[PDB]
Design a protein around this ligand. Structure first.
Ligand SMILES: *[C@@H]1O[C@H](CO)[C@@H](O[C@@H]2O[C@H](CO)[C@@H](O)[C@H](O)[C@H]2NC(C)=O)[C@H](O)[C@H]1NC(C)=O
Ligand SMILES: *[C@@H]1O[C@H](CO)[C@@H](O[C@@H]2O[C@H](CO)[C@@H](O)[C@H](O)[C@H]2NC(C)=O)[C@H](O)[C@H]1NC(C)=O
Ligand SMILES: *[C@@H]1O[C@H](CO)[C@@H](O[C@@H]2O[C@H](CO)[C@@H](O)[C@H](O)[C@H]2NC(C)=O)[C@H](O)[C@H]1NC(C)=O
Ligand SMILES: *[C@@H]1O[C@H](CO)[C@@H](O)[C@H](O)[C@H]1NC(C)=O
Ligand SMILES: *[C@@H]1O[C@H](CO)[C@@H](O)[C@H](O)[C@H]1NC(C)=O
Ligand SMILES: *[C@@H]1O[C@H](CO)[C@@H](O)[C@H](O)[C@H]1NC(C)=O
Ligand SMILES: *[C@@H]1O[C@H](CO)[C@@H](O)[C@H](O)[C@H]1NC(C)=O
Ligand SMILES: *[C@@H]1O[C@H](CO)[C@@H](O)[C@H](O)[C@H]1NC(C)=O
Ligand SMILES: *[C@@H]1O[C@H](CO)[C@@H](O)[C@H](O)[C@H]1NC(C)=O
Ligand SMILES: *[C@@H]1O[C@H](CO)[C@@H](O)[C@H](O)[C@H]1NC(C)=O
Lengths: 494, 491, 497
């Protein structure tokens, strides 16, 4: 008659990591890292994104003739842009505060083009100007959303234009100034010398003087156009005045939707899916709390860590019994492969029956503790750092370096935190299982007191031939020492 | 004869958290977080702050007629500014490098107004300009610290003015340029076209051309005024030259005190109390090492963590035991003991007792005190937040600042919570291990002359008195003396 | 008739820190912090640095007469500069985007000077202008790399100049504009009022108008010179045009090597060494993974932490057996201290038979403990290689907010990593000491379980057998193949007595 104490064993092959030891096989393990994507760009919560193709943001907003499919655009969830777009400013020039405009657009979802200064209103100027830089079917053309004002006949009168915003939302207005390359061009276009362009709102006051200089030919042109933008508030008016060199707007952009969006730098095309998280390399469909695909992300999906494997050890160490009679063994030499009922067991051999009964109170406590540990580990890492895309100009290298260093540092800190937490928790889990088995064995030894012959394999042979009910009493904790101690003493005295 | 090993219990209802367990009752605990404030603004170390009221920094430094109570200002600890002040620039315009000026002012404690260009020196111009934008009792007026220069008759001679910084410290100077709305206003105000304003020092060199354009009316005016500033070093000179459109200064602001200060964005008011540090919501009065009121504080007071609870366990589990034959540590704690933590219940032929141990308890107390001190000390070099202001065209910089501060606060909060949880686990395991070690020590000393009852203590196989049990407690138990006695009774 | 279980103690004196106790003596420990330097500025991989001396970057690039030894410079590994150099802009003025130029130079290793606008192409102007602000031997002079254009007679024709970049690499070009102090100076120098300076490239378009004003005298002059720069791409053209106030370049700087370098603020002089990384205070020669000298380093060498000590406990606890029973006295075990006669391993099996004694060492436990501790040290060192490295940056007088942001970011990351390292060391020390204690207890418990009841424990660390044993039985107990069913009768018979 003997009750033996041991633990569970199975045929799992999962391997976890520990600070003191690597390459450790366990019974059950939980994976927290997702490393798979479908590699396709597609729709976020039913709203397709805005595909710019070979066009840039400036080329879309100004109305490049090549970007003629973006004249009217529906609601979008994010914007696809290429690293080096081909169709930008067809006429060579610059764009003031381009990165600030992109940052503002990174949180706008829909637009609404409003005709604020119709082309027919300029009855004292010529509005059919064009250039060969932006040519359609050989003939010269121009930006579709802007008007090029030139002299009519031989005089260029003072040009005035105003607009009072009553559209119900904030508005985006873009204008420009032309810089010719010689006085002959200036006289043949505007007939005046010493011109100015003045723009004035309630908070904006600018005066621009054109600069005439010789420059290298870009797109076959020596001149340049400089573009500026502003945000017009509700019930606020904008005023234009110029004696020449004014590229007046015709359309204003009204902010309609607003929301959470972004500009994603990719070179792919939109496919047919339905996803919830989108990365530049692909989409993610998972319920795991971590991922290692790309730091930049639009939507809702797990956090980012630079790790290759994050596995949490939930079960016990997998060391079997190493492959005739009386081999009931114990937890000293290994686990039991034939329990499959619980975690810590009470294998027994009574004079009439034998079995592999499993404990219930200790297993429940261990499971509750492990589940609490897993939940705490997950809940400690939902306040991580999220990266937001930003763009910088050629003369903003210090700021770009600062941003990159900040992002990299925070990412490294959080990765280190996650790895250290997983390793330490694995160590404590294995120690916890060993301690629980030892505590069970010690409690049974204390209860059995003297009427037991401890064998050293992990279990003890009784000094009395006590039946089942005695043994369920031992397992339950209600073993009565003086009930049957006289017979045990008599048997031991032999 | 029985000697039982156990642990102390009481009636406390303090709960701590752990990685494996939640809401565990402990005998003793320490709170590390303050969550209360008086909801008031008052003096920092006896120096009252500077209450702007319905005014802004630009309106105070330029001399807005509504801010006439700030013409002379004493020493201050911090500046109270509303989010959207009403009295700023009376005449519409703009201020160049405003945020840099605020950043500079955040480390200045006292000013001193010095008359650097008296109004009467401009004997070839008119210095009685005004506007209805800032009018007092109907009649037009102007900024009190600046001079508007206008025709004298029908001519505007070239205006020249210089100042040499012999005051004693650095000085702040402000000047302005006027942009009219039409040529008629320019001709009736200055009688010149194509004017300029030139300012030059040993470092700065500027020349501004006025702009004339049609603009929407703000405060009833279509014109604008553009203001600039510079810091004049000691024994340096500043020169003014203009043929028109010049708003010249009359006073300069000398940096007198310097120190550590800040600007608070609050809508409250100053009342009569005293504090050691101040937050925008109220004052803090504590000796605790953490708080969760507001990240931006001025003074000397604890670190900020975005947490609702931070409790450290400095005691044992509260599991009280529930006739005769007093049990031990297997069944639970003892309420009788009041002296120490680890128990050595005393029972004998003539008297019993509830004696404590003075060796293990001292070691445990020293270890726990060292742990608490290490936890508090390892966190005295954590991040602190400093206020900053950004313009409408610096949203990327503002986002970078906000993200950096938020990330550092999150990192430190995570560190705090993880440390507290791990230390609580370690403390509970430490106390259990200490009790087990005491029991094992007693069992090792008592080889065979005792029998294990199994519930936490032994019954001796031999008769003894207080001497034997005191020897057991002191680790001087000797086997050979009472050996034959026990071997006889073992039969 | 006695085997005993114990551990190892020696003559060491190293001390470690623990989260529960301070200044604990351990047998072996490993240091991870380097706190020494030679206090010298030396070569980096055989390439000497660029010694500016009393000159600034602007003075070197523009060609100050005092910096005449830097006209031709070889390859460099880093740049040594002073906090407040004396010889900068000889003629007073400014330098637009100075800090951006310094940031660009922080990744350039060699320069090669190309003559792009020879001084003799200006056949309609005067190219011998000079000033007394920077004069050699009393006679007036000017920047050696730039040309000051003035009148030839009583006229100033329009000046034009172009260059096509066929040098094979990106190029740095610097020009300037002169602001006089009165109209008399302007007429004496140019005979033109309303002049302009226009510079135009593929992506650059600028136009400057000189400003005339009265300013205080700096180095005896009331005028200022404003300098601008640009980077010229390959196969691109730069155009110049001015009616006056043009300070044209003669040489252009061609980027040749490129690499990882920086600008170091020091007041020292170069000496003869060969180091692998350099700090502003000195050079470092170490194999440790940490140092606490200076946050700004150039080269390859360990990470930086604000700590005074970082010692890892790789050994046991030094608690020697203070009591020493002279001659007579049984040898105790592990409860009352460690042993000194042990010289082989950490956990031992001292035995005392009738034909001799011994101090043997268990090899199964010692090797496992060594493997575990080595893995622990390797993991600790590995986890801290993804630290934060600081980079020097310069800011102007109107960028205080950005400077504060940079300083706070660097400092905060520094404190975070220092805290991480210190906490890891403390916790690992605690776990190591408890690990050794648990290993000794496990050895004792294992032998007790194997040996069952054929002995009597004395509680001092070991037990005396109830039967006669020899070297074979000692070896069987130590190895783990003790045979109970062959001694039970004799053991019981002896114990009954
Ligand atoms: C721009 O349009 C708004 C709306 O029509 C104008 O605001 C109105 O101004 C008149 C003044 O004659 C008031 O009587 C109305 O009550 C105003 N309406 C609202 C809704 O406030 C505004 O004046 C126009 N801007 C300009 C420069 O004329
Ligand atoms: C501003 O004032 C200071 C001191 O009043 C002037 O410095 C003095 O200059 C004279 C030149 O004639 C010297 O003789 C003195 O020794 C200087 N004194 C000191 C204390 O340095 C300074 O020159 C004045 N600024 C200007 C532009 O003249
Ligand atoms: C600068 O020099 C390059 C190379 O010498 C010029 O590029 C050549 O342009 C001509 C056009 O007339 C082509 O026929 C050649 O094939 C080009 N050569 C190369 C190597 O690309 C370039 O045109 C010059 N810049 C200017 C403004 O003329
Ligand atoms: C297990 O073997 C070695 C242990 O040192 C380890 O390097 C290796 O990576 C492990 N095996 C796998 C498949 O990772
Ligand atoms: C995401 O994966 C789940 C698997 O649980 C699947 O049922 C679901 O259809 C997937 N979603 C998409 C959009 O493919
Ligand atoms: C204590 O915390 C547990 C979470 O495990 C919660 O279920 C319980 O309600 C809490 N007790 C009280 C009194 O709030
Ligand atoms: C701060 O609290 C203490 C209580 O410890 C009290 O004595 C003191 O008066 C308080 N300070 C003020 C300003 O009320
Ligand atoms: C301790 O003993 C060792 C013996 O190997 C010796 O080398 C060392 O110098 C001694 N230390 C002191 C401080 O005497
Ligand atoms: C070692 O640390 C303890 C801290 O408990 C301190 O009291 C002692 O002075 C220290 N010893 C030395 C030599 O620094
Ligand atoms: C660096 O130190 C080692 C000793 O650890 C020495 O052998 C080597 O010569 C030193 N290097 C130099 C450059 O002095």
């Amino acid at each position: 008659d003997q009750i033996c104490i041991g633990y569970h064993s199975n045929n799992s092959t999962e391997k976890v990591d520990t600070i003191l030891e690597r390459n450790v096989t366990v019974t059950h393990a939980q994976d927290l890292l997702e490393k798979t994507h479908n590699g396709k760009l597609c729709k976020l919560n039913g709203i397709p994104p805005l595909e710019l193709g070979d066009c840039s943001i400036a080329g879309w907003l100004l109305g490049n003739p090549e970007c003629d499919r973006l004249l009217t655009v529906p609601e979008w969830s994010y914007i696809m842009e290429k690293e080096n777009p081909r169709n930008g400013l067809c006429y060579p020039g610059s764009f003031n505060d381009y990165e600030e405009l992109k940052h503002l657009l990174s949180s706008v979802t829909h637009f609404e083009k409003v005709k604020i200064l119709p082309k027919d209103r300029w009855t004292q100027h010529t509005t059919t100007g064009g250039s060969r830089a932006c040519a359609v079917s050989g003939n010269p053309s121009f930006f579709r959303n802007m008007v090029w004002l030139t002299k009519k006949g031989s005089n260029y009168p003072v040009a005035k234009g105003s607009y009072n915003n009553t559209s119900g939302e904030q508005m985006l207005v873009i204008w420009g100034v032309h810089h010719p390359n010689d006085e002959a061009e200036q006289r043949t276009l505007y007939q005046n010398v010493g011109t100015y362009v003045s723009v004035g709102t309630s908070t904006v006051n600018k005066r621009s003087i054109p600069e005439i200089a010789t420059r290298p030919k870009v797109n076959g042109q020596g001149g340049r156009m400089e573009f500026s933008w502003t945000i017009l508030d509700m019930l606020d008016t904008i005023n234009f005045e110029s004696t020449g060199n004014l590229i007046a707007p015709e359309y204003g952009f009204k902010i309609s939707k607003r929301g959470s969006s972004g500009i994603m730098k990719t070179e792919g095309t939109l496919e047919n899916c339905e996803t919830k998280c989108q990365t530049p390399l692909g989409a993610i469909n998972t319920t795991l709390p971590f991922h290692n695909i790309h730091p930049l992300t639009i939507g809702e999906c797990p956090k980012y860590v630079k790790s290759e494997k994050l596995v949490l050890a939930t079960g016990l160490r997998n060391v079997p019994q190493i492959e005739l009679f009386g081999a009931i063994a114990g937890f000293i030499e290994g686990g039991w492969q034939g329990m499959v009922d619980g975690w810590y067991g009470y294998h027994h051999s009574n004079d009439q029956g034998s079995g592999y009964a499993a404990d219930k109170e200790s297993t429940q406590k261990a499971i509750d503790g492990i589940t609490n540990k897993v939940n705490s580990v997950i809940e400690k890492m939902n306040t991580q750092f999220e990266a937001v895309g930003k763009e910088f100009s050629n003369l903003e290298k210090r700021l770009e370096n600062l941003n990159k260093k900040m992002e990299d540092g925070f990412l490294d800190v959080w990765t280190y935190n996650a790895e250290l937490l997983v390793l330490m928790e694995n160590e404590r889990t294995l120690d916890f299982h060993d301690s629980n088995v030892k505590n069970l064995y010690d409690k049974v030894r204390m209860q059995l007191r003297d009427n037991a012959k401890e064998l050293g394999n992990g279990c003890f042979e009784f000094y009395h031939k006590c039946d089942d009910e005695c043994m369920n009493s031992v397992k339950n904790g209600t073993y009565d020492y003086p009930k049957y101690e006289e017979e045990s003493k008599l048997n031991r005295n032999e």
